[PDB]
Design an enzyme around this catalytic site. Structure first.
Site, PDB file in Angstrom:
ATOM      1  N   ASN A   1     -26.837 -10.469 -29.904  1.00  0.00           N
ATOM      2  CA  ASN A   1     -26.566 -11.884 -29.671  1.00  0.00           C
ATOM      3  C   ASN A   1     -27.714 -12.485 -30.378  1.00  0.00           C
ATOM      4  O   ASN A   1     -28.875 -12.264 -30.054  1.00  0.00           O
ATOM      5  CB  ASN A   1     -26.197 -12.383 -28.273  1.00  0.00           C
ATOM      6  CG  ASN A   1     -24.957 -12.409 -27.861  1.00  0.00           C
ATOM      7  OD1 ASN A   1     -24.057 -13.310 -27.864  1.00  0.00           O
ATOM      8  ND2 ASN A   1     -24.312 -10.981 -27.526  1.00  0.00           N
ATOM      9  N   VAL A   2     -27.396 -13.579 -31.009  1.00  0.00           N
ATOM     10  CA  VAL A   2     -28.343 -14.378 -31.788  1.00  0.00           C
ATOM     11  C   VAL A   2     -27.977 -15.937 -31.193  1.00  0.00           C
ATOM     12  O   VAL A   2     -26.705 -16.294 -31.213  1.00  0.00           O
ATOM     13  CB  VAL A   2     -28.371 -14.528 -33.135  1.00  0.00           C
ATOM     14  CG1 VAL A   2     -26.937 -14.467 -33.807  1.00  0.00           C
ATOM     15  CG2 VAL A   2     -29.216 -15.629 -33.767  1.00  0.00           C
TER      16      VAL A   2
ATOM     17  N   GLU B   1     -22.536 -12.906 -33.760  1.00  0.00           N
ATOM     18  CA  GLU B   1     -22.618 -14.180 -34.558  1.00  0.00           C
ATOM     19  C   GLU B   1     -22.815 -13.968 -36.034  1.00  0.00           C
ATOM     20  O   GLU B   1     -22.527 -14.670 -36.799  1.00  0.00           O
ATOM     21  CB  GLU B   1     -23.793 -15.042 -34.102  1.00  0.00           C
ATOM     22  CG  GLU B   1     -23.488 -15.650 -32.667  1.00  0.00           C
ATOM     23  CD  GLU B   1     -23.917 -14.752 -31.468  1.00  0.00           C
ATOM     24  OE1 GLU B   1     -23.732 -13.430 -31.793  1.00  0.00           O
ATOM     25  OE2 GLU B   1     -23.898 -15.090 -30.503  1.00  0.00           O
TER      26      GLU B   1
ATOM     27  N   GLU C   1     -35.235 -33.513 -24.020  1.00  0.00           N
ATOM     28  CA  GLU C   1     -34.072 -32.831 -24.514  1.00  0.00           C
ATOM     29  C   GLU C   1     -32.976 -33.647 -24.842  1.00  0.00           C
ATOM     30  O   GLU C   1     -33.290 -35.259 -24.832  1.00  0.00           O
ATOM     31  CB  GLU C   1     -33.709 -31.937 -23.376  1.00  0.00           C
ATOM     32  CG  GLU C   1     -34.316 -30.526 -23.131  1.00  0.00           C
ATOM     33  CD  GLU C   1     -33.694 -29.526 -24.166  1.00  0.00           C
ATOM     34  OE1 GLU C   1     -32.743 -29.826 -24.867  1.00  0.00           O
ATOM     35  OE2 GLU C   1     -34.125 -28.406 -24.182  1.00  0.00           O
TER      36      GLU C   1
HETATM   37 MG   LIG Z   1     -24.000 -15.520 -28.387  1.00  0.00          MG
HETATM   38 NA    NA Z   2     -23.193 -11.171 -29.512  1.00  0.00          NA
HETATM   39 NA    NA Z   3     -24.520 -18.319 -30.021  1.00  0.00          NA
END
Ligand SMILES: [Mg+2]
Ligand code: NA
Ligand code: NA
Ligand SMILES: [Cl-]
Ligand SMILES: [Mg+2]
Ligand code: NA
Ligand code: NA
Ligand code: NA
Ligand code: NA
Ligand SMILES: [Zn+2]
Lengths: 67, 476, 475
Positions: free
Chosen positions: C161-162, C225, C276
C-alpha cells in the site's frame, strides 16, 4: 351459495377433483378466497372482508409510475 | 460426497438413512398434510421427511419435511447424516469460495422436467395435489418453490438471472398469486417491467435438488447467479439446467418435478393471503401480484415438494438457518476481515449476532452498519448484537454474558428510526419499516475511553494439567 | 497527456500559464509558507509556484502543484478549463479499468537511482526543509507518497500500500510519521510491532501527480495504488523500480527523492503540533519514529511540498475528488440506485449522497453503507442523503432538499459511540464522534406519507419560451 370471507354471491366453481367425485373447489372472485367442498370453512371475524376493507388494503409491491 | 441431480435421488438417500417414512394409506389433503408436517417437525430431532403416496382427490403424491431436520440438512450436503451444526457451517464456508461454477446446459431431450407438456386447458390440480397449509390461509399455497426470473433491461446477462423462493397462492386453474416482496431481487425486475406496463416472464419450479431450493432462499447479491453457487456447494460439480420452453433467457433445473412457465400481469394486484408465516402468526391479506400460467412441463408421476410452516422451528426454519448466516458472514468479511462469525438462524435473520475483533474504538458499530447495508440485513435485521472475537455468537449462553458485562445502555445501545423493514415482522407498526436496534456488546478499544478494568482472567497455572489429573482420578 | 515524472507535469503547468517562477532568493521560514497560502488565496486559476533559490539550501522547491481546478484538470491530461463534473465523470470512467499492472524497470533506467547516499545521512543536504505553520512542532514533509508492505504477506503485491502521511523531521536521519489507526499503514505496523520487528518503509517525494493523487485515495487494503495509476492514465502502465535495501518494496521510477528506512517498533516520540486541513492546529501526540537508512534521488532534486490550513488550501483541492470517487464506487457496487457522492468538504467529514430510494427508508441504508466503508466509517460524521434529481454538489439544491424533505422527528438520526477521526476538533472523546444521518429524500412506500410531495411539471411551452425569450433579448 355465498363466500365465507366476504359474503358475495359472485362465487363460481374453480375445479373438479381429478379422480372421481371426491370434491369440488370454489372461488370468490370478489376477494380470491378459495375452498374445497369437503372442508366446511369458518373464517374468523378477524379475517373477513367487505368492499371497504378491500378498497384501502395496501399493495405489495408498489406500482411504479409509467414514464 | 453424493451429489444429486433430481429430488428423487435425494429422497432415495433419505430413505436409505432412515430419514424418510412412507404414508401408504390414502389420506384426504385438508387437515392431514399440514398436520403431518407440523408433527414431523414437532418430533424434535432426527425429524424425517414424510412421503404421502395417496391423496383423496388427486392422482400424484407429495412429500413435506424434506429440509426439516439437521440430519436431512447434512445429507443434503453429502455429509454424514449426523454431521454437527458447526461442521456443516464450516463445510459451506469452504465450498462457497469456489463461487463461479458455470452450470451445464443440457439438451431438451435429456431434461426429465420436459417429459410432459400441457398446453390445452391448463389445470394445476391435475398435476399438483394442492392442499391448504393452515386453517385460515386464504387458499391453497405452494411454499417451497424456486422461481426463475430475468432482468428486463439486461435479459442476456446470465448473472442478472435470479432464482428465489416466494409463496404462491393458487387463485384459479391457470392463475396464481406471487408475493413479490419489495426488498427481494424479483421486485427489482418487476419494477423495470411495470415501469413500461410490460409483463415479466417467470418460471416456477417445484421439486428440485435440495441444493437448488437451498440457494433459492439464500440472500446473495443481485449480480450473482444461484445456479453457479449450486456448482460450488457440489464441490465443483456443475449442476444441470435446460432452457425454458416459452422464454429464453430463462433456465430451469433439468430434474425439476414441475415447471410452470408464465408471466406476471403488470400493474395489477389482487387479494393475496392471509397466510401463516414463519413468525408463527398469520400474515394479513394484502394486494399482491398475479401470474398467468401459459404452459406446464413436468416429469412422469410428479412429486409435490411442499413444506409446512408456522410456530417457529418448522421445516422452513431449518432451511433458513445456515443459508442466511453464510452469505451474511461472507458479505461482511469481504470489507471487514476482523469479523469472525455471523449467527442469523433466528426468525430468518430478523435477529443477528455478530462476533468480531474490534480493530479500533467503535468498530463494532461499523460492523453493524455493514450488516444493515447488506442485501438481506438492510430490510430484515431489526436487532443486531455485536460481540467480541472470543464469544461464540451461536452460544446464546455466552451472548447473554456479553450483554450483561459489556453493554452500557448509555452508549452501547443505539436505536434508529425510519429504517427499511420487512412487513412479515408482526411488530413493525409502520408495516414493512422497523426501528433498528444496535447493541455493542464488545469490550471497549482505544480511542474509546474505558476507566474500568475489563480484561479477561487468564486461568491459573496448572489448569491444563489439572483437567487431565481430575479426569484420570474419576476413572475409578 | 501522460506523465512519467513530476518534471513533465511541471513543464505542462508552465506551458498553460499555471506555474510561476520565483527567481529571487528567498528565506525558507516565513516565505515558502506565505507563498503557499497566498497562491490558494488567489481564488481561481491558482498556479503552482516554483522557488529557484532558498537561503541555506542548494536545490529548489515547488508548492501548490495540485492547488486549483486548472492544475487538477491538467493532471488528468484534460483541458485546463475542464469543469468539475466533467473531471468527476472522467475519473468515474478510467476507474473501471482498475487492474493495470505496472511496468517494472531495471535499476539503471530509473532516474530516482541517479544518486545514492550511504554514508553520514543528512536530509537537509538534499531537501530544502522549511516550517509550514508558525506553531508547527518542526519542519514537515506534507505531500509525500509512502510505500509499505504487509509483513504477514510480503510477496502479495496487492497488500503493498502507498498512502500519504505527514512527516516531521526530527534529526539529520530520523523523522516522525503519523500512522493514524484507521489508515492502511496502521494495519501493517500492528503486525510488525506485535513481533517487535521493524516495518520497512519507502518515502517518495516529487512524483507523477497521479501517484500523489492515488496515495491520498481511500481504496481498499487489497488494492494496489500503482495499478490504479495505470487506470487513471487510461491504460498506460506506470513505471516502478525495486527499492535498494528492501525487496517487496517498489517506488515510482521518476521520483525526485526516495527515503528508504524502517519504522522503529514499539516506540513513540513527541510529534506535532501541526496545522491540519480543518484550519486548526492538531495537538502534539506520541507518534512513530522512522530511521532513514539510505537516500536515492535524482540530480538537482525538486521538493514537492504543500501548504495546508484554513480550508481550500492546496490539500483541499487534492482531496476533493479522490475522496468522492472511491466512495461513489464503493457504494455503487452494492447499491446501483446511488447517483453521485459529494465528499469534497473537509476531507469527507461531511458527505452528501444523491440516490434513488428503492423502498421506504432506503436512504438510511445508503448512509449505513457509507458509514461502513474504509474512509467513511472513521471520517464521515454528517451524512446527508438527497433524491436522485438533486445535485449533491449544488449546495443550493441540497438546502432545498433539507427545507422541504426533512422531518426531524424521523429523518434525523443521531448515533453515539461510533468510529471517529481525531483530526476533527469537534470530537469530545477524541478520535470518536457521534454520527448524524439526515434523510432529505422524498418518502417512498411503505413509509406513510399523507402529504403531496411530488414536483411540478413545468408549464407546456417552457422549452420553446426559453428560446423565444433569449431571441427577444438579442435586440
Ligand atoms: Mg491504500
Ligand atoms: Na494496497
Ligand atoms: Na491510498
Ligand atoms: Cl476499576
Ligand atoms: Mg438472488
Ligand atoms: Na436467492
Ligand atoms: Na443473480
Ligand atoms: Na461495549
Ligand atoms: Na424524508
Ligand atoms: Zn369473498
Amino acid at each position: 351459495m355465498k363466500c365465507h370471507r366476504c359474503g358475495s354471491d359472485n362465487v363460481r366453481k374453480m375445479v373438479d377433483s381429478p379422480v372421481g367425485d371426491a370434491w369440488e373447489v370454489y372461488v370468490c372472485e370478489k376477494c380470491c378466497y378459495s375452498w374445497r367442498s369437503t372442508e366446511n370453512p369458518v373464517v374468523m371475524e378477524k379475517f373477513k372482508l367487505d368492499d371497504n376493507k378491500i378498497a384501502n388494503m395496501g399493495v405489495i409491491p408498489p406500482i411504479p409510475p409509467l414514464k | 460426497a453424493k451429489v444429486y441431480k433430481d429430488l428423487r435421488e435425494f429422497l432415495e438417500v433419505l430413505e436409505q438413512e432412515g430419514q424418510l417414512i412412507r404414508v401408504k394409506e390414502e389420506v384426504n389433503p385438508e387437515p392431514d398434510i399440514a398436520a403431518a408436517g407440523r408433527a414431523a417437525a414437532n418430533l424434535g430431532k432426527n425429524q424425517p421427511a414424510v412421503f404421502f403416496e395417496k391423496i383423496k382427490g388427486y392422482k400424484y403424491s407429495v412429500v413435506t419435511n424434506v429440509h426439516g431436520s439437521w440430519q436431512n440438512h447434512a445429507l443434503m450436503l453429502g455429509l454424514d447424516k449426523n454431521t454437527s451444526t458447526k461442521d456443516q457451517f464450516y463445510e459451506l464456508n469452504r465450498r462457497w469460495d469456489k463461487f463461479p461454477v458455470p452450470p451445464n446446459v443440457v439438451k431438451r431431450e435429456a431434461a426429465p422436467c420436459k417429459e410432459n407438456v400441457i398446453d390445452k386447458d391448463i389445470n394445476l390440480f391435475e398435476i399438483l395435489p394442492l392442499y391448504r397449509i393452515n386453517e385460515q390461509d386464504g387458499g391453497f399455497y405452494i411454499s417451497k418453490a424456486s422461481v426463475v426470473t430475468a432482468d428486463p433491461e439486461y435479459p442476456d446477462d446470465f448473472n442478472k438471472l435470479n432464482v428465489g423462493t416466494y409463496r404462491i397462492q393458487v387463485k384459479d386453474r391457470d392463475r396464481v398469486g406471487i408475493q413479490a416482496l419489495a426488498m427481494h431481487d424479483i421486485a427489482v425486475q418487476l419494477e423495470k417491467a411495470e415501469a413500461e406496463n410490460k409483463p415479466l416472464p417467470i418460471a416456477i419450479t417445484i421439486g428440485n435438488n435440495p441444493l437448488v431450493t437451498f440457494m433459492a432462499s439464500t440472500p446473495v447479491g443481485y449480480n450473482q447467479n444461484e445456479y453457479e453457487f449450486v456448482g460450488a456447494l457440489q464441490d465443483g460439480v456443475p449442476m444441470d439446467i435446460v432452457k425454458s420452453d416459452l422464454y429464453d433467457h430463462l433456465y430451469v433445473p433439468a430434474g425439476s418435478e414441475v415447471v410452470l412457465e408464465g408471466h406476471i400481469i403488470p400493474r395489477v394486484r389482487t387479494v393475496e393471503g392471509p397466510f401463516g408465516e414463519f413468525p408463527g402468526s398469520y400474515s394479513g391479506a394484502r394486494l399482491q401480484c398475479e401470474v398467468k400460467i401459459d404452459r406446464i412441463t413436468h416429469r412422469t408421476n410428479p412429486i409435490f415438494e411442499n413444506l409446512y410452516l408456522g410456530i417457529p422451528w418448522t421445516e422452513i426454519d431449518y432451511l433458513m438457518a445456515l443459508n442466511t448466516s453464510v452469505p451474511l458472514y461472507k458479505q461482511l468479511k469481504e470489507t471487514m476481515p476482523e469479523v469472525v462469525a455471523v449467527n442469523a438462524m433466528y426468525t430468518h435473520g430478523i435477529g443477528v449476532i455478530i462476533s468480531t475483533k474490534v480493530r479500533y474504538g467503535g468498530y463494532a458499530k461499523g460492523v453493524a452498519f455493514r450488516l444493515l447495508s447488506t442485501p438481506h440485513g438492510m430490510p430484515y435485521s431489526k436487532i443486531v448484537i455485536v460481540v467480541d472475537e472470543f464469544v461464540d455468537p451461536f452460544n446464546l449462553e455466552q451472548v447473554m454474558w456479553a450483554l450483561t458485562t459489556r453493554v452500557h445502555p448509555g452508549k452501547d445501545v443505539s436505536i434508529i428510526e425510519n429504517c427499511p423493514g420487512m412487513p412479515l415482522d408482526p411488530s413493525t407498526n409502520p408495516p414493512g419499516m422497523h426501528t433498528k436496534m444496535i447493541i455493542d456488546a464488545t469490550t471497549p478499544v482505544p480511542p474509546e475511553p474505558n476507566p474500568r478494568e475489563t480484561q479477561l482472567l487468564d486461568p491459573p497455572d496448572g489448569t491444563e494439567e489439572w483437567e487431565e489429573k481430575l479426569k484420570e482420578l474419576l476413572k475409578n
